[PDB]
């Protein structure tokens, strides 16, 4: 049955679902069971119009029958579900995650509610502008990387952070990263990994090496100039497959566009170093980004202003 409770009862039902009638958590008072279930169509209903296609489902607008809250559905299939995705933000203190409202299993399908964060993706904001100024986007890495720095420390690997894997709110001031469907556990080094974005990929990964916290720090600098030059590392220059080229080439800092401050290009060049080892974390690149902001004069670009042209 399904039933209101607490995260860890959650997580360890969510290992027998990853392991393979009606059954999960709600984590929140928004959603509500009646008589400890909750089915689709029946005590909630997903709206037509799609929030956007995470990494093994569809992304719906729900709303509760009862309470008449609205959240965020993710509906993935028992074949392709992983635990993980739940561990990663089943009762998070930081909010630079997006947080989990709950999680049901109806018949094949996991349904995993999630709190709406109503100003789209960071991906969607650099689509539309072109690309976002130094400021808009040192900014962005920030939250990103205070997100990171909280995972990492909770032992979970993001293992795919980029901007349509960052939320964003309705004002823009607040960021927040989604979709932990390529999730992954850390031990006192990774375990099983599912690919992410090609563009994003560190040398370790392509290289097939262990693999740690610092994956995530290049795939958010990677990230970071995507936000500065419009489009994705590597792309300009290399026609795919690309991992024999993140494996053999430099790394990417010579598309640091020239106007970036001194401390922006160097945050950038610590972050996208190949050997992990010589890789600041999450944290510490969080610092050296925050004083980077503040050398540039803090975030005084507007919120959604005029469009500037990506490089070609
Ligand atoms: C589209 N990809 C995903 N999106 C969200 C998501 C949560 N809350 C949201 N609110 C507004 N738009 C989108 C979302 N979660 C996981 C995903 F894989």
Same mark, same amino acid.
């Given at each position: 049955?399904?039933? $209101?409770?607490?995260?860890? $009862?959650?997580?360890?039902?969510? &290992?027998?679902? =990853?392991?393979?009638?009606?059954?999960?958590?709600?984590?929140?008072? &928004?959603? %509500? @069971?009646?008589?400890?279930?909750?089915?689709?169509?029946?005590?909630?209903?997903?709206?037509?119009?799609?929030?956007?296609?995470?990494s093994?489902?569809?992304?719906?607008?729900?709303?509760? %029958?009862?309470?008449?809250?609205?959240?965020?559905?993710?509906?993935?299939?028992?074949?392709?579900?992983?635990?993980?995705?739940?561990?990663?933000?089943?009762?998070?203190?930081?909010?630079?995650?997006?947080?989990?409202?709950?999680?049901?299993?109806?018949?094949?399908?996991?349904?995993?509610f999630?709190?709406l964060?109503?100003?789209?993706?960071?991906?969607?904001?650099? &689509?539309?502008?072109?690309?976002?100024?130094?400021?808009? =986007?040192?900014?962005?890495?920030? /939250?990103?990387?205070?997100?990171?720095?909280?995972?990492?420390?909770?032992?979970?690997?993001?293992?795919?952070? %980029?901007?349509?894997?960052?939320?964003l709110?309705?004002?823009?001031?607040?960021?927040?990263l989604?979709?932990?469907?390529?999730?992954?556990?850390?031990?006192?080094?990774?375990?099983?990994?599912?690919?992410?974005?090609?563009?994003?990929?560190?040398?370790?990964?392509?290289?097939?090496?262990?693999?740690?916290?610092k994956?995530?720090?290049? $795939?958010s600098?990677?990230?970071?100039?995507?936000?500065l030059?419009?489009?994705? +590392?590597?792309?300009?220059?290399?026609?795919?497959?690309?991992?024999?080229?993140?494996?053999?080439?430099? @790394?990417?800092?010579?598309?640091?566009?020239? $106007?970036?401050?001194?401390?922006?290009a160097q945050?950038? /060049?610590?972050?996208?170093? &190949?050997? +992990?080892?010589? #890789?600041?974390? =999450?944290?510490?690149?969080?610092?050296?980004?925050? #004083?980077?902001?503040?050398?540039?004069?803090?975030?005084?670009?507007?919120?959604?202003?005029?469009?500037?042209?990506? #490089?070609?």
């Open positions: 049955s399904v039933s $209101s409770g607490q995260a860890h $009862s959650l997580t360890s039902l969510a &290992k027998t679902w =990853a392991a393979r009638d009606n059954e999960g958590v709600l984590l929140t008072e &928004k959603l %509500k @069971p009646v008589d400890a279930e909750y089915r689709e169509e029946v005590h909630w209903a997903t709206h037509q119009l799609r929030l956007g296609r995470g093994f489902g569809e992304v719906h607008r729900m709303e509760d %029958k009862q309470t008449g809250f609205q959240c965020a559905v993710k509906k993935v299939s028992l074949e392709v579900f992983r635990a993980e995705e739940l561990m990663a933000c089943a009762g998070l203190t930081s909010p630079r995650i997006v947080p989990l409202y709950g999680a049901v299993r109806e018949g094949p399908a996991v349904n995993i999630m709190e964060l109503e100003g789209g993706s960071l991906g969607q904001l650099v &689509k539309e502008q072109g690309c976002l100024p130094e400021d808009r =986007a040192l900014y962005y890495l920030g /939250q990103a990387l205070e997100g990171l720095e909280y995972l990492h420390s909770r032992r979970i690997l993001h293992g795919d952070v %980029k901007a349509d894997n960052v939320l709110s309705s004002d823009g001031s607040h960021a927040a989604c979709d932990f469907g390529h999730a992954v556990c850390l031990q006192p080094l990774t375990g099983d990994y599912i690919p992410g974005t090609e563009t994003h990929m560190a040398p370790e990964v392509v290289l097939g090496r262990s693999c740690d916290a994956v995530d720090v290049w $795939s600098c990677c990230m970071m100039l995507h936000m030059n419009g489009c994705h +590392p590597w792309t300009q220059f290399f026609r795919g497959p690309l991992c024999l080229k993140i494996a053999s080439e430099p @790394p990417p800092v010579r598309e640091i566009p020239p $106007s970036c401050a001194p401390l922006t945050a950038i /060049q610590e972050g996208l170093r &190949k050997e +992990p080892i010589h #890789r600041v974390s =999450a944290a510490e690149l969080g610092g050296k980004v925050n #004083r980077a902001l503040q050398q540039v004069g803090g975030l005084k670009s507007p919120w959604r202003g005029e469009y500037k042209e990506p #490089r070609h």
